Amino acid sequence: YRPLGDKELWHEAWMYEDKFGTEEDPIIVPSLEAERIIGVTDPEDETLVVWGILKDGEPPRQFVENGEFYVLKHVEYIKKVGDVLEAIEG
Amino acid sequence: MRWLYSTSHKDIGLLYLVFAFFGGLLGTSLSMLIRYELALPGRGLLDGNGQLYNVIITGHGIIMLLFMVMPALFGGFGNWLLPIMIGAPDMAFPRLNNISFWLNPPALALLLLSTLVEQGPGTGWTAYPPLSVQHSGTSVDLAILSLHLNGLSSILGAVNMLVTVAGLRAPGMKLLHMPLFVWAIALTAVLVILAVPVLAAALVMLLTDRNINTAYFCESGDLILYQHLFWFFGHPEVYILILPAFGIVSQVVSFFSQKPVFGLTGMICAMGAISLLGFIVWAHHMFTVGLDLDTVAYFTSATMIIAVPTGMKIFSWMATIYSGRVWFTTPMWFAVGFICLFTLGGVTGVVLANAGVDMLVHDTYYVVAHFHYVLSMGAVFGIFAGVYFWGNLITGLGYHEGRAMVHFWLLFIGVNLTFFPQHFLGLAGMPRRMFDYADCFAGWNAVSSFGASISFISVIVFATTFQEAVRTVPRTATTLEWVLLATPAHHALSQVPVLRTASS
Amino acid sequence: ARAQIERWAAEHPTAPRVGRIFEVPLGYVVPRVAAGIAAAGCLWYMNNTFLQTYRPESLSKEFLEEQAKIGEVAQRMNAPPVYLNPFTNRIPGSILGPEDAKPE
Amino acid sequence: PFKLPLDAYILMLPITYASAAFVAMCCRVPTADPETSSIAYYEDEQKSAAAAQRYDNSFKQFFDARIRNHKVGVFQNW
Amino acid sequence: DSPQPWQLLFQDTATSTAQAMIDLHHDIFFFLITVVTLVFYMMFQIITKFHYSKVLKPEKLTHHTTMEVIWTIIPTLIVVMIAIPSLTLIYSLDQHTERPGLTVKIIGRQWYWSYEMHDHLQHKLLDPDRLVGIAEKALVK
Amino acid sequence: GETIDKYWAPYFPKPAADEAKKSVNKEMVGFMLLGPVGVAFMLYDFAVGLEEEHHVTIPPYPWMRIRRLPGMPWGQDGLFEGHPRVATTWP
Amino acid sequence: EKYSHEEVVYGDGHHGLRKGYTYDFEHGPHYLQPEKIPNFWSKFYAGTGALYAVGLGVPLFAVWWQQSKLKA
Amino acid sequence: DSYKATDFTNPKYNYFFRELTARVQGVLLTGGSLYGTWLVVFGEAQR
Amino acid sequence: KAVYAPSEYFKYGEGASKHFGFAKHVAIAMTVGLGLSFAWKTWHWNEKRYIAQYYADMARREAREDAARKSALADKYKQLEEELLS
Amino acid sequence: HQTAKEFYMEHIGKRHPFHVLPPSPWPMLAGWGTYVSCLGMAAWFHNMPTGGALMAFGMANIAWTAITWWRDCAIEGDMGMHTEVVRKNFISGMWAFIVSEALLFVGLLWACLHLGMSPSVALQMQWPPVGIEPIGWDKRALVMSAVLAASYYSANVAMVAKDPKVVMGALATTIGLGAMFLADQYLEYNETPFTITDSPYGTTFFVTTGFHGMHVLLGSLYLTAALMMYKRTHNAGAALKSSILYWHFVDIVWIAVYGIIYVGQY
Amino acid sequence: KPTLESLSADELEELKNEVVSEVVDKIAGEDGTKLADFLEPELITAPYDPRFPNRNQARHCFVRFNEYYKCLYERGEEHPRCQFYQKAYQSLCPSEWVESWQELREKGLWTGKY
Amino acid sequence: MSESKDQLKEKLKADPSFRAELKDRIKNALLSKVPASVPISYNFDSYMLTEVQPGQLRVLEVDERLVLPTNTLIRLLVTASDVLHSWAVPALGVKMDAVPGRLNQVWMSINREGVFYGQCSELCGANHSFMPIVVEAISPRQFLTEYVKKWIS
């Protein structure tokens, strides 16, 4: 994970991961439903934002050019990281 | 029940838009009487009743300033679009958002009811004393109470907007990733909170002069103090009504050019500089009241500095269209028409800002032409640009493209041939708020009255544009309202979307 | 940025993409804006004809002929009459009015 | 909120100028001639004439030479 | 003196101040013509030359520091060039540098105007020293 | 026992018992600086109230007793005005 | 029941079509479904005509009212 | 076990505060609005 | 085989803007605008020239009556001179 | 109903910390109550019969709907619907409302400063006008200053205290010191040798002090409503902090009002 | 006969007065109805007071009106300065303002000391 | 007696200082024949003409004009009685509001003779359209020799 200092404890991290999504090793995005809107910035320009829709049971998907790949996973609970695992502090 | 007890921002925004359309119909109807009386020298359909003409222009100016443009831009598009755009699941105070709407039909009813009482409130939309004090009866009190209720509506809406922006943003989204529409609405809310209570104080002073025999603006008081307080409100008021139009033009221009906005931080600094300079130049409405020459000197030198940020915004819009892949539809034309015709209204403001030149054209139809350029080409074009752009997302109905271009061209022909001859009338010396003029002013008044009929016919054709919509599935977008279905669900953003920064 | 344009074009199928600046053909636009201008002219004419209660007597043709005989001349009660607007009608600075001119 | 772009300081120079002019204008008004709540202020004619002429001269004496030279336009129209 | 049919610009003037106001207005219109023409021409060219039938896919142009500084520093110079004559015209509205010759009190009522005057007319012998010498040579003989 | 406030409670920690009493003493010093003396003088003022009298009639200057409309919405005299002081005779 | 604090706080747990709606606006995919109101285009045109008639006829009534007061 | 009869927010008081007032006040405002409209329109000011 | 994000932009310089000529069009626009502005200022200078000639002619006329007034005054002085010498 | 809480947890509560409201009827009733009270106020200005009664009827309807709305807000605050971020949203909203009221007071004191500094020829250029006796600063207004500063410090006590008895006592002390401000203002209004129709001095004094006193009354009622919720559960949340902020705002407004009117003779 | 070498100063002054008057009555007239061609009319208005610099000139009116009655109280009724103040306020003040000020003076509602 | 008068004339012939003193006495006696100052005063109203003839302008024509000399510094004091009005003459570059209780001064000097028109430029009631302004400008010698003789009592 990234340093959790100066982060709100209820932000559901995975967005604070130390991993760049590749085709062979994507970032798994948890979801409470079969589809979920996320937002990816442009790696060469922070001011540019692209919103996309991930679907369950689909191949890895890239949103911006030279950006990460993402896979949705349907879960019952999403870890509200800031008190879920840094309280575990394993 | 649904439309009476609602707590959803999307129902409240649609109610604001329908209310603003009703107010626009009322002000269109009140404006055909103005142009039908002024078509020919002498006495027209008003039978020489000057008090009724003053009532008509007062009600028409107040309605079009406060019950059409603000409920369409600030209340209609802002409430529907802000939580979807920043990713908030709802507003910060959902029931305050319903009383921010429901104080507007009482204010409209009071204003329309003041016309049927006594001889009506013929004072102008500015309502200067001692003419407003001299009016005997009930009509002026109903008009000022209507303004009080509308100001309370605006203050409550601005509080809800400012708390919704600061505290319900999506995770990971800072004050760099919000669209320029959000920045415009936030700056408009700040202006409303800083400006409306000064008007409320001046109106309380007006009621105490009228009904309590107090000494605010009277024999022993000072009548220039009213103009100070009212225009300290009123010059922020005209920038309240044009900033959401700037936001809508930015969103429309960036969409069909297939490009992001040129100079985002410059755009935000320009909107902030416009918001800050609007509070120190109010006395350019008071060059002819007898102020000292140093005060007039300052208010002349500080008014023209507003040209620089607006020019930066216009040039950045042109740079956004520049080097893009442009597709011209009906909202794209209303934005191009905005940028072309707001520039014409802005340059006459620089002329009016110079005080020596303003001694010749004060209270003439030159001023009328200036502010109908910056309001019928600036705010009305911005409103109609958003109606065709977001309409299938908001209402669930599409629009016929050919009839919308017919409506755009009828409107564009009508309002240009209405207010462009009024420049020549105001330069020659035709004064404001008069229903009869000298014999030589007949030609341009006939031309302007011909143009107003084309504008009315354009208003008629707009009701025929609506048709059934086609629905598809979204995948990606650059803003959050275009990855949603048309129409969205009652709880749009069923899961809160987050913004992830790319890793190393 | 391209996919949202392609989504908007699918939800607005009556908007043409045929490769020209005015996507709606002008054979559709021109007769209908002409019909709108014709209806506006009908309304404007009806206002000019049937909705006037006082036409002033300075617009009658006898007044107009008698005024055209005088021209742009203003009388004075303490002085000889004077030409109105001496710059846009190019009266020379030696001549002040018609009676003081006394043509040679 | 962001990095102030090279434009924003060029904007901020006349904005600071307008704010300083506004503050100086509001400050000099309680040091003016007609802001006296007495009739006995005007019975000292030397001091009152000196104060009101000082209220005339400041911010106008910068313009006296070009008022006398009729520099009332950007161009020179005779 | 009076307005005219189909008139475009101002009326003719009888004071130097009104002429100076019209001169200032025409000086401002000098700049406004160039600004409006630049905007309209550049927008026509951008509309025609960047249609989607001419462009395969857009370019990524987000910022340009030189052009932004240029269109910020150019209108500021126009504003400060316009302002100094306008400020000079404002401070010229007081013209009390002569002996005043008349006072007229104008009162506005509903609905008419009222004009008042109360001055004093005094007579002075025009060039009395010639009459003084004429009396001197009348008395010397 | 499954409320939203309890559900999100561990994610919003309180910012960190005798320091509270120290702060109470610090603020109560300023409270007792101006507390008892103002209450004592106000309780004195409540007993020296409507007993004094003024008989200074005021001449009817044009800026006194403005009557642009006849009377007041409640009556003739001002609200809270037991004894008008402006001359109604004038002489 | 029916007036408890939970009814105030979480509303009434109604499911399905409300009273006369043909679509679920609260929990369905669209909060406005104008293609499912029966005879929608008649009602839309009647409502738009009523809105146009009132919005263009209120100032005419106020002109007729003020001028009938003088002509008496 | 956390509510008394003296408590303003008692659940037994919810019908009176929320259901009865919603119709009583709803008809009172209609009656007041009609009378106020007639009073301001067809009334004569004595001051 | 995943799903890839397509290329969406050209770099500024090799898209459809190399053939535009921004500075050429700016020079054309400035030349046209300055031509129209100098035409307007030319008309204004013409009108001011006529006004200056008008006021010069008026001063030429007004200098004529006031010389004949002083001439008549000197004639009355020459009459009053012989009135007190005869 | 039993599944409505389950539905809220499954769909709104467990996803984000923000509160979503069911439909409510009070904004519509409050708007039409403002309409009725405005018609009544217009009739009451021009001495129409049964006009003040209509204005009081409309104001009573507005006050009843506002109390019902605030009772619903307190009920929702006691079923634990408001997390910490919702409470910070409440504090930010009160800050915005306070800024609006401060600008209203700035507009009110603008008129006092303008009218007092340059007396017109209609007043024969003397300020304060002859016949007007100004209210001094070395008398009962100074007692009000001391009392209201003590109320400021006592409200500051209740913000930091953790003992419930000390909090309730400090709240009651601030409420009682506020009620002593108003009953002394009533005595100033009765003993003063000028009315609201006597000169712009009387006009500005009475209008400004009346608005300030009405804000003192509203802040005291807000602090009283905050105390009874703390009396029951020993937990107030945002009701205590927003009320203490509003009371501090009133205390800050009094400083400007006193310094301009009572000291500056404006 | 008293010649010029024996006359005093007062007799010589009277003789000078007789000599001047007996010819200027023929030149100008006994009343002065003959100088109408040698007379230049000029109109006198209120001078610019440096104490009153603003465009609103109500205070100049009021102060001149009050200086007139102060002059009337202090330096008699027929002093030239009092006439200067009277013509100064008459030149500036509207007639309605002045008549309102004498009715306030007659009713006793004038706040001036004099 | 009579020779002493002749001796006074001989001293006028001889002494230049006595000649100058008696010349000054002549100048003192001639100033005594100059008529004293007389006040000029008027108060008239100016109303719009309801019916005009050819050579007159509808709406803009009045019954009583304001007569002002040319090449003279004129102070215009503008005020009102009931509501706000504005005294606007577009040909002379003067437009200043008439405020009840204020006394707004204008310094004005007219270059050429003529008849200048105007209207009121502040909304003031039902008949705001029908308050026109006409200023007649004449030469200063005519103004000081003929027009001001109409207001000598």
Ligand code: HEA
């Ligand atoms: C928003 C501001 C606004 C708008 C749009 C207009 C629109 C028009 N106005 Fe006016 N006008 C004013 C603001 C406006 N006006 C003000 C402030 C005054 C001063 C009054 C006073 O002095 O007291 C005034 C007064 C005024 C005068 C001067 C009267 C006088 O001085 O005596 C004239 C003269 O011709 C005029 C005519 C027109 C005409 C022909 C239109 C036409 O454009 C007709 C309108 C046509 C439209 C197309 C606009 C309607 C918009 C919609 C219908 C959009 C809403 C739709 C949705 C929300 C879906 N109006």
Ligand code: HEA
């Ligand atoms: C939409 C509302 C709106 C907007 C945006 C504006 C914008 C401006 N306005 Fe105006 N105005 C009104 C609405 C508005 N106004 C109304 C309703 C009235 C009459 C009130 C009444 O009823 O009495 C009024 C009256 C009014 C007056 C009072 C004059 C009088 O009535 O006697 C003045 C004086 O300074 C003024 C000036 C300006 C200026 C300088 C701007 C500037 O913000 C505009 C700046 C924009 C540009 C200048 C063009 C873009 C810039 C460039 C392309 C760069 C190049 C420019 C230069 C180099 C100079 N307008």
Ligand SMILES: [Cu+2]
């Ligand atoms: Cu403005």
Ligand SMILES: [Mg+2]
């Ligand atoms: Mg005006």
